Design a protein around this ligand. Structure first.
Ligand SMILES: Nc1ncnc2c1ncn2[C@@H]1O[C@H](COP(=O)(O)OP(=O)(O)NP(=O)(O)O)[C@@H](O)[C@H]1O
Ligand SMILES: [Mg+2]
Length: 418
């Protein structure tokens, strides 16, 4: 028995099943991605394409990246060239067979890209209708991570596309936060999302600098803005441990394409561990035991036999032997790639981009610098509880809302009751 959809979630599902192209939006942890999974379950799978803007977000819903589905290269080539790319075997069939296109984490899709995809859809499908007649089912939060670009110009938000409102004529909202159960923390997060750091909000975030977020032998994951710093931190902390290194090598269906798998999986080709290593579980092994995607633990031993698999103690108190798992990546043109590896990554540090869409419960962040719009909010809103969060050097300068996004949302609401 599925959880009970809220009335707001039910209204989105109703619209989708009526065939309406929609955008649905809501704060972090309002159940957008969960609702996509419910929508996907409710639809005939033939003709239904599940995508997200990022690899990390696509895996959450069992889908592919928007980039892989589109099959237009970077998207920076001239339109005619993108159309020709979309016409390639495997890519073309994807476009033609698509009746419904799900896109999670839309805030990272820049307007110029959306325009290109819209034009490609019409050309490949030979349908003179918005987005080639595809039913779009889009969600995300424009107050979370901002758009990225494969070019060099300042990206526009997806809603700035001249085709946005024609393509998603209806917007619905999810307004109840579920990730956090604590109303004090819910209200704090909403202040941050809107860029309203009163004296009280700042003091409450500053108070978290004293939080003990870990447990015996488990330390906080430091959320960082850039992968360089993540890598360096994880490598150095592992190097510093006195234990000998235990290695686990991935088995890929096509080892030549290990680079493409590395970019769309949360585990690496070569996993190195020691006693004491700080790790993140990156598969849902057991919701009832708390062994879920994002759970933080520490390696407490290695089995004597066989491969010498790691024993990991998690924040919840469960100690489990971590066995092999598998990922299948839906790459461009219908190609599938798989990787077998243990579902562990080092987690002294993690990038905020890689945390996108996740729930976490043992995190530290330094918020004394200018960040991208929405980026501090994403980092803070990963935590299930305020007591799993440690904010160092907080300054409201870290919390920025792009005025374009506030304007969008205000417009959206103009005719609404609340
Ligand atoms: N109707 C519901 N009742 C109870 N819990 C729910 C409901 N809908 C969603 N959840 C839970 O809400 C939590 C957050 O869901 P999630 O799908 O990650 O939200 P989201 O809006 O996609 N978050 P983000 O990607 O960070 O903006 C998950 O633990 C869900 O199980
Ligand atoms: Mg989500």
């Amino acid at each position: 028995s599925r959880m009970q959809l809220s009335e707001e979630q039910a209204a989105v599902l109703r619209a989708v099943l009526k065939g309406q192209s929609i955008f649905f939006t809501g704060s972090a942890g309002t159940g957008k991605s969960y609702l996509l999974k419910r929508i996907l379950g409710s639809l005939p799978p033939t003709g239904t394409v599940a995508t997200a803007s990022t690899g990390v977000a696509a895996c959450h819903i069992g889908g592919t990246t928007l980039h892989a589905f589109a099959g237009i290269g970077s998207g920076q080539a001239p339109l005619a060239q993108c159309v020709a790319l979309a016409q390639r075997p495997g890519v073309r069939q994807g476009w033609l067979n698509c009746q419904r296109l799900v896109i999670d984490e839309i805030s990272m899709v820049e307007a110029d890209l959306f325009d290109k995809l819209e034009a490609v859809a019409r050309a490949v499908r030979q349908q003179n209708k918005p987005f080639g007649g595809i039913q779009l089912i889009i969600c995300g939060d424009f107050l979370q991570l901002p758009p990225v670009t494969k070019g060099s110009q300042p990206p526009r938000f997806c809603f700035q596309s001249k085709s946005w409102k024609r393509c998603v004529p209806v917007t619905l909202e999810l307004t109840k936060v579920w990730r956090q159960a604590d109303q004090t923390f819910i209200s704090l997060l909403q202040a941050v999302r809107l860029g309203r750091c009163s004296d009280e909000v700042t003091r409450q975030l500053q108070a978290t600098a004293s939080h003990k977020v870990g447990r015996d032998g488990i330390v906080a994951t430091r959320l960082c803005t850039h992968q360089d710093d993540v890598a360096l931190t994880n490598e150095r902390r592992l190097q510093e441990l006195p234990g000998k290194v235990h290695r686990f090598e991935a088995m890929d269906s096509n080892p030549e394409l290990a680079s493409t798998l590395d970019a769309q999986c949360p585990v690496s080709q070569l996993l190195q561990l020691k006693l004491g290593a700080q790790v993140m579980l990156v598969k849902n092994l057991s919701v009832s035991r708390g062994l879920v995607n994002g759970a933080r633990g520490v390696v407490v031993g290695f089995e004597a036999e066989g491969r010498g698999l790691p024993q990991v103690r998690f924040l919840c108190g469960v100690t489990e032997v971590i066995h092999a798992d598998r990922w299948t990546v839906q790459a461009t043109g219908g190609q599938l790639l798989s990787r077998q590896q243990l579902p562990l990554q080092l987690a002294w540090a993690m990038s905020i981009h890689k945390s996108q869409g996740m729930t976490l419960d043992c995190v530290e962040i330094s918020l004394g610098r200018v960040f991208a719009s929405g980026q501090a909010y994403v980092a803070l809103s990963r935590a299930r509880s305020l007591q799993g969060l440690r904010v160092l050097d907080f300054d409201p300068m870290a919390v920025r809302c792009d005025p374009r996004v506030l304007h969008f949302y205000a417009t959206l609401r103009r005719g609404r009751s609340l």
